[PDB]
């Protein structure tokens, strides 16, 4: 979608593995606030929006 029509989504009830990302692309911009990406896979969350 375009910038003024961003595509909100909710993602719950799942065993979420954040290492499927790394097979995607060179990832020009990838920076996390409040949590380090390396120690992400272990932690649990309330509600994950994308």
């Amino acid at each position: 979608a375009s910038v003024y029509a961003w595509n909100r989504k909710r993602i719950s009830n799942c065993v979420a593995d954040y290492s499927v990302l790394y097979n995607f692309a060179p990832f020009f911009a990838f920076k996390c606030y409040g949590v380090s990406p390396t120690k992400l896979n272990d932690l649990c969350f309330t509600n994950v929006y994308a």
């Binding site: 409040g34 949590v35 380090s36 120690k39």
Partner: peptide
């Protein structure tokens, strides 16, 4: 700080931050 308990700080963050 982002949280009051030491465990969360030391769990969800790399040592430098």
């Amino acid at each position: 700080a982002i949280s009051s308990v030491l465990n969360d700080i030391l769990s969800r963050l790399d040592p430098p931050e």
